[PDB]
Design a protein around this nucleic acid. Structure first.
Ligand code: NA
Ligand code: NA
Length: 327
DNA sequence: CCGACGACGCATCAGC
DNA sequence: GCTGATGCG
DNA sequence: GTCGG
């Protein structure tokens, strides 16, 4: 549905969501508003009243009332007020820095630190993650065109294979589903020597190599199984440099790899459905394993999984291409 | 009425 | 110093 | 804030 249909309503609900998360620290209200915004955004009719919207799942009495106020007046008094509230709008803004969450944003604003300029003047008050989030503030808010994601994938797969040709690497997320753009890069990594029953350095050796070839530029966090950092494609001598991009790399045991690839490929709606179907078939699926459920509901040992298809076969579902996992 | 609403890796804090 | 809690994503 | 046991 065109954004002109209910974009006013959905924009209002998304703004209310952000204030719940970042200012009121009410995460379940943030998700309530997002859920409302999503079901309205997919509604293929320009809404005429709150009662109409309340028929939708996730829209209740309070949001119906707000929609009535918005349709009648073109705005929402409470949103107008918080928008111009210097403290609340500054707290909400600062959480756009990666590493600054609601608690840090509140603490900063409490001591007069309200803008990117104020953060730049107060480096010693920022931790390592927050300094990187500030350094790449604008780059991190840009989307990644699919052509750049392919070039990024070219580098990851080549360097991974270079370290050890027995590594297996898969770039998941919307990109694997075919998306024309991405917000970041999610790489899932495994190695036949790493199973749930049985090296460190498996992840470090890959991160190191990507740093040696100057693809990974910064690290946000790094442990034995999860890396979160920054990468950047090489710029042709003489062309504008590519923005810096967020990349995550996860090391997963081989016997849990394809469960992980399935989960992190998504979509979220699709996983909810598959997990719903799996239950009504006698199986429980999480990001790690698929396990059978006994007649009293006791989950048994995880079942062998050697491919994505294996998971579909267990639950009597035809294999769906990532391209067809929108829901 | 009133609890669920995602679990978890990593960085860093709070407490001992 | 070690252990658990909290923040963040 | 919404849903539902
Ligand atoms: Na409803
Ligand atoms: Na943030």
């Amino acid at each position: 549905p065109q954004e002109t249909l209910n974009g006013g309503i959905t924009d209002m609900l998304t703004e209310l969501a952000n204030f719940e998360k970042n200012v009121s620290q009410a995460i379940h209200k943030y998700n309530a508003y997002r859920k409302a915004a999503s079901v309205i955004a997919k509604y293929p009719h320009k809404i005429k009243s709150g009662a109409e919207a309340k028929k939708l799942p996730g829209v209740g009495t309070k949001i119906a009332e707000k929609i009535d106020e918005f349709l009648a007046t073109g705005k929402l008094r409470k949103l107008e007020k918080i928008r111009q509230d210097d403290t609340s709008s500054s707290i909400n803004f600062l959480t756009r820095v990666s590493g600054i969450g609601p608690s840090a944003a509140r603490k900063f604003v409490d001591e007069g630190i309200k803008t990117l300029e104020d953060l730049r003047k107060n480096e010693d008050k920022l931790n390592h993650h927050q300094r990187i989030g500030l350094k790449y503030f604008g780059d991190f808010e840009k989307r990644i065109p699919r052509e750049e994601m392919l070039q990024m994938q070219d580098i990851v797969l080549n360097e991974v294979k270079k370290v050890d040709s027995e590594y297996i690497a898969t770039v998941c997320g919307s990109f694997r589903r075919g998306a024309e753009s991405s917000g970041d890069m999610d790489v899932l990594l495994t190695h036949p020597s790493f199973t749930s029953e049985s090296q460190p350095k498996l992840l470090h050796q890959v991160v190191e190599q990507l740093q040696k070839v100057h693809f990974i530029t910064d690290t946000l966090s790094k442990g034995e199984t999860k890396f979160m950092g920054v990468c950047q494609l090489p710029s042709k001598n003489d062309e504008k440099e590519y923005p810096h991009r967020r990349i995550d790399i996860r090391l997963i045991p081989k016997d849990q790899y394809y469960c992980g690839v399935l989960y992190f490929t998504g979509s979220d709606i699709f996983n909810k459905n598959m997990r719903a179907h799996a239950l009504e078939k006698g199986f429980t699926i999480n990001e790690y394993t698929i396990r059978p459920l006994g007649v009293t509901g006791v989950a048994g040992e995880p079942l062998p999984v050697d491919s994505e298809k294996d998971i579909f076969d267990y639950i009597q579902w035809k294999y769906r291409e990532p391209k067809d996992r929108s829901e």
